[PDB]
C-alpha cells in the first residue's frame, strides 16, 4: 500500500477511488470498512496489519482566472477553488 497518494484502491470485497491516509478512529475487532452519513466508503481497515485507513475523494475543483482587464494589462493569475499547493500540477 501507498499512503498520502491518490490511487485506485481495490480492497477485499470493495472497490473505489480515493486517497489513503493514517487513521485515528478505532474499529471493533469484527468490522471491516467504516462509513459515514449518506453511506459512502469513508475508511477501510487493512487486512494485513489490522490497521485503519481513512479514504478521501480525489482532489478536484474548478479553476478561476484573475484578470484586471484586457484594456489595462495582459497579466493574469489562475486560482484553484480548494487545492493544497503540493498537488497543483496534476492537470
Amino acid at each position: 500500500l501507498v499512503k498520502n497518494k491518490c490511487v485506485n484502491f481495490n480492497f477485499n470485497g470493495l472497490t473505489g477511488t480515493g486517497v489513503l491516509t493514517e487513521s485515528n478512529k478505532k474499529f471493533l475487532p469484527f468490522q471491516q470498512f467504516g462509513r459515514d452519513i449518506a453511506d459512502t466508503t469513508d475508511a477501510v481497515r487493512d487486512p494485513q496489519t489490522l490497521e485503519i485507513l481513512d479514504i478521501t475523494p480525489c482532489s478536484f475543483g474548478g479553476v478561476s482566472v484573475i484578470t484586471p482587464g484586457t484594456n489595462t494589462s495582459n497579466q493574469v493569475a489562475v486560482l484553484y477553488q480548494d487545492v493544497n499547493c503540493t498537488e497543483v500540477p496534476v492537470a
Partner: peptide, 25 residues
C-alpha cells in the same frame, strides 16, 4: 454562535467560502 449546530465535501459537490468572513461581519 454557540446556539447553532448542524455541509461536507463529496464526490461532485463543493462548498465555497463567503467573501465576508465571520470576523469581518
Amino acid at each position: 454562535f454557540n446556539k447553532v449546530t448542524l455541509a461536507q465535501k463529496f464526490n461532485g459537490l463543493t462548498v465555497l467560502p463567503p467573501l465576508l468572513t465571520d470576523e469581518m461581519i
